[PDB]
Ligand binder design. Sequence first.
Ligand code: A1LZ4
Ligand code: A1LZ4
Ligand code: ZN
Ligand code: ZN
Ligand code: ZN
Ligand code: ZN
Lengths: 231, 231
Amino acid sequence: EYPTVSEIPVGEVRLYQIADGVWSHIATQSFDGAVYPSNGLIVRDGDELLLIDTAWGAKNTAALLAEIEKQIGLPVTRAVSTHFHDDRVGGVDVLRAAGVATYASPSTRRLAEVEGNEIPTHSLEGLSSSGDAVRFGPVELFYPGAAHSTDNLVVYVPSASVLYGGCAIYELSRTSAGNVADADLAEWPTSIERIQQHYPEAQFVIPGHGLPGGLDLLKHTTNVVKAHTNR
Amino acid sequence: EYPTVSEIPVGEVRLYQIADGVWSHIATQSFDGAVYPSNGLIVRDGDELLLIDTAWGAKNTAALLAEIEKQIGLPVTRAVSTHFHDDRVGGVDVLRAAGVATYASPSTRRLAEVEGNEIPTHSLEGLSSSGDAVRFGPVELFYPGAAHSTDNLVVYVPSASVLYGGCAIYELSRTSAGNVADADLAEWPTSIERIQQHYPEAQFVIPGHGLPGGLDLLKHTTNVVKAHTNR
Ligand SMILES: [C]=C([C][C]1O[B+]([O])([O])C2=[C]C(Cl)=[C][C]=C12)C([O])=O
Ligand SMILES: [C]=C([C][C]1O[B+]([O])([O])C2=[C]C(Cl)=[C][C]=C12)C([O])=O
Ligand SMILES: [Zn+2]
Ligand SMILES: [Zn+2]
Ligand SMILES: [Zn+2]
Ligand SMILES: [Zn+2]
């Protein structure tokens, strides 16, 4: 059922309904001569929508907004970027130009600025220490500690028991680390433990890239990260 | 009009005519949650065809045989695999069942056996020392030294000035290294130099994955491999 990377031509965006008022968005991008999929989230908040993460670049994010208008027809009023890399903030300027209020932690905003990446406008408070959680509209934002990056956040949708791990969680078909230049390999498994402890009831776990599954995606990612550490 | 990874569904194979009696074949496959294109070669040999490399797996290789019959209509009678990895030998059993004489160096055959990969039946002698070259019908086979793998061969078609580099040569769009667990990073640039020195006349250079170019692909690959060495 879930759209796979093979089925999505680069430039177009698919929406996958997970529960009442909860969708993922799936886009693709060419990167180093291979095509990667990328996930984000859409969560209904009253008669508006909350967006988690861009669709990886300005072109895709413009298509995301148009696909939301076509299929859902409620306004995206706020968006959160879960860390500073280009697949999560690339497209923030498109969102801002369309009237979406964009948000990230102060750590993400600073790292995006240093990297020369697009910078969400608003700063999320209350997420500065490992284990911090804050409610943001219909989701909980959680900072589990440093992992894929030092600033990475995860997002939980309580009404649907949906956990979106971002790039800190790998899909099962991924057996080797992705980019780790900005990672804290030493803390990544502990941070994953924090997620497990905080969201043990999660039923649907979405990685940054690829197919969702259950909570075993967390242990899978730990296994891959530890294998890379010992490599 | 060279087909790119975005234009080929997994399971389908495209042929690209380079010259009289010379084609590349292009397929795609998912690996670690990304989709990659992959190239091989077809060279006319009288009223028969010589195949260089499978189409990365049994399903793609059967499609490759169907596409050759449809677009060319000459029988593939021999095939050469340019190293032991699955994108070069995956499908050899399909070839053999169809009556193709499959060949690889003894080095490639030993490594495929160790790895659990399909093993081409016949052995190419005369390719065990760096710099060795042997004529094989309408191509020359060349062992440049260890690079992407210890057994990697390159293939030159003198009638068309086509050099097929396999996985030892990267396309321009690839600015970071692929799999290097089996590589000899220390020797890889020296091996590429041997290719340059032996085939300075090459006009059309084909990497193992992605778009062909000129001999600048050799300098490009050296740049990438040295950058990887230093990180
Ligand atoms: C799958 C990936 C790659 C993906 O995830 B990421 O590291 O946040 C990023 C950044 C950019 Cl610029 C492009 C692609 C990506 C990974 O690093 O785990
Ligand atoms: C582009 C690649 C990947 C490709 O190249 B390869 O390393 O020969 C291989 C093996 C398997 Cl099993 C799957 C995919 C590939 C690289 O390593 O340079
Ligand atoms: Zn990232
Ligand atoms: Zn990512
Ligand atoms: Zn290989
Ligand atoms: Zn390859």
